[PDB]
Amino acid sequence: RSEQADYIYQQIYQKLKKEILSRNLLPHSVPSKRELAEKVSVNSVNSAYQQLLAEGYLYAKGFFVEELDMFSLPDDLKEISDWISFSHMSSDTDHFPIKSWFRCEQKAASRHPQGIYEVRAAITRLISLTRGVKCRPEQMIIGAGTQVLMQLLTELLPKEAVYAMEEPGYRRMYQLLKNAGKQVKTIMLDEKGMSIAEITRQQPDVLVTTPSHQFPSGTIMPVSRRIQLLNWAAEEPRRYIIEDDYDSEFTYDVDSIPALQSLDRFQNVIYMGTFSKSLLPGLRISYMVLPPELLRAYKQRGYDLQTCSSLTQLTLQEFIESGEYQKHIKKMKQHYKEKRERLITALEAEFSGEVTVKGANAGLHFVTEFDTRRTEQDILSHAAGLQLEIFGMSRFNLRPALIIGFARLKEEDIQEGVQRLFKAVYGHKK
Amino acid sequence: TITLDRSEQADYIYQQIYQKLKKEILSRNLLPHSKVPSKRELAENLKVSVNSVNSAYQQLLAEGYLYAIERKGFFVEELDMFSAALPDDLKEIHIWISFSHMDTDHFPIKSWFRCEQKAASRSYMSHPQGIYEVRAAITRLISLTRGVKCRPEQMIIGAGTQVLMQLLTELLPKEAVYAMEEPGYRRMYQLLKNAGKQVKTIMLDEKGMSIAEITRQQPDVLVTTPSHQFPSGTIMPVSRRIQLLNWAAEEPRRYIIEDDYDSEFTYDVDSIPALQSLDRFQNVIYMGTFSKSLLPGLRISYMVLPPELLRAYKQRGYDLQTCSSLTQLTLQEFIESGEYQKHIKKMKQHYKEKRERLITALEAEFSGEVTVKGANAGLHFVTEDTRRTEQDILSHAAGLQLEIFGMSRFRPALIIGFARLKEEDIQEGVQR
């Protein structure tokens, strides 16, 4: 009567449901609305009956019961700290100017499947100046992360396309391609990156490459190799190059290197870019630039829906157009440059010449080889059991070596983290 | 000769030097392996700092336009080359009364931002499935609103229903045979098709998705819209619901995907408990969404996985969450503060009124085509005596500044939506 939790019409229709289900109120067999009403309003019983009648528990004495057929988590799946992390995955709530982001969002509220046009135009403007990427906003597709866009691209590309990826390379993308039923050839690297020698031997249709900063090996692909790939694609129709530009704004000794696509004169390179390592933690905004022919193939689908929220897009635009973004990148560049030096100094201290640091002075990771003893597994297990998040290089197969990411590493925890690493590398006692 | 700006605009001296040198190397003006001046030689002959020349050469060297040899100097790298406008139809004409089924106002954007500020202060990737506490919040809500029974571990949040559906088809058996309502949600049909899946089509009767037809064809996975069939807004009676559930329970490896897209909006009765609330055998995959009930262009959706499809998901380990952590946390706060449910009640009434108004206006100017098929729920209904070919009514409508869609896409019929149509502009809309 108090109607706490549920109103009276809800309590009556819930009971009638339950009693219809248990068969206590048998098929085709109910009181008049007034009859049931006559210690509750007719309004209540009308509401109940309406419910029951909309749902199929009753049929239009008064009304009649429907006649419904009778009806014909494991511990290990449940979800269960003070960790230091050398993970290459994402960055951190470091020195992200979050107050300015919110301001831009505020402002953005005051102020299309491929993403909003003005946002696309804001991104296109940026990458022309920052990457030498040549495109019209019509060519850009925005997406909630690169994986969403890579899925779409595998559909826009021809169905039997043979993909070739870098070995070692980005395992996550190899998995996506593998899942999508594609044949994926793997191409070893030489000192210049993805080998055009083996791209010639094995014959693929679609290369996947990280020429600004090879993932994971950290090598920058020199222009001589870039031209060689660009020429290989330009002969024979239906050869494509997916350029995975995941970290190219961060180069510490030189200006960012113009994108592979900037040298393409034959519209064979699909430029894939991302803000996922540049904005707030947990936000994934990526984009890709389709050559005319693939934009057409997208155009003729027409059923795709945009994965980034409108307000997130507009916030990004405001961030870019206010100048806050360029300002942000410039500070972060300076902070990572220093965090990298500091990390490498600590590594040089603890390991001396027993560590070899590999890869370019760029991005948010490098590679680290160690003068033997233990297997990759030994180190990982040892490190796992010390609250240090680390990944071995063998993960990127498609003397033990690890990838060391420093994006989501706090500067305070560098020394402790390196010592934990040393402990892991050489498995010591107490 | 290298001309410099000196005005220093567009480009620093070092950038101008490396740009010019890149050009002369590329256009074979410098020829492979020839030496380039000492740093000091070039800095004096150009009348600039040696620093500038140094930065310029350091660029050249990192990118492979030059190479070094100790003591000897810097040389032009040897490079090959090949010799092998956007089409007008791909141009984007960025320039009407909408009766589209796919609400910019009425949303309490200020409470949203308050929840955002509240979330950003308490907190600040996190988890492939979505943040745990966000899943827990959604799980509580749908228990109460939908009768859905699950633990947050079974939940996968996604940036819209397409991303979740794509993932689901990788979790399900590879050769699984799907079955869809006919007519149905075309977008979802294309996706299934694009994944190379066999998809059977199942006709409707007065009770929605035909169990007889399901029995005939023998699919493994149903896709159904039992709260409000899309497009023909038939509410699947509990009689038929029970039939589909028994089917899935009879035989292993049968699944029901419940696409719940608008169930929070029923105007004459309480929202109807999910098909999945009545399932006892964990065979229904509940797919829900906030997409028709939040900020205009925000897509957050979620699916609830039977423990075995969860298992398969956990055996992958490489999927990354598509909804931003900050938005998820905002949604959580928004939900837990009561603001969400508060906003749903207001919208329901506002949609109730606008719908009653819309048909009032629809019949007062028709009574010839005024057959309004579909139920008193959700955000769309149907309209089908005279008329020309279906494609024609769509043609004149385009001219008459009127976004309207034809049922053939899912005697001529039109689907009409009213979520994005102002109270102000109804009478003119009908007139057209």
Swiss-Prot record, chain A:
Domain (HTH gntR-type): residue spans on this chain: 6-68
DNA-binding region: 33-50
Cited PROSITE patterns: HTH_GNTR
Molecular function GO labels: DNA binding; DNA-binding transcription factor activity; pyridoxal phosphate binding; transaminase activity
GO terms for biological process, alphabetical: biosynthetic process
Presence of keyword Ribosomal protein: no
Metal-binding found in the keyword field: no
A Pfam family reported for this protein in Swiss-Prot or TrEMBL: GntR
Keyword list, A-Z: Activator, Aminotransferase, DNA-binding, Pyridoxal phosphate, Repressor, Transcription, Transcription regulation, Transferase
Database matches in SMART domains: HTH_GNTR
Family named by the database record: In the C-terminal section; belongs to the class-I pyridoxal-phosphate-dependent aminotransferase family.
Role of this protein: Activates the transcription of the gabTD operon. Is also a repressor of its own expression, both in the presence and absence of GABA. Binds specifically to the DNA region overlapping the -35 region of the gabT promoter and the -10 and +1 regions of the gabR promoter. Principally regulates the utilization of gamma-aminobutyrate.
Protein name: HTH-type transcriptional regulatory protein GabR
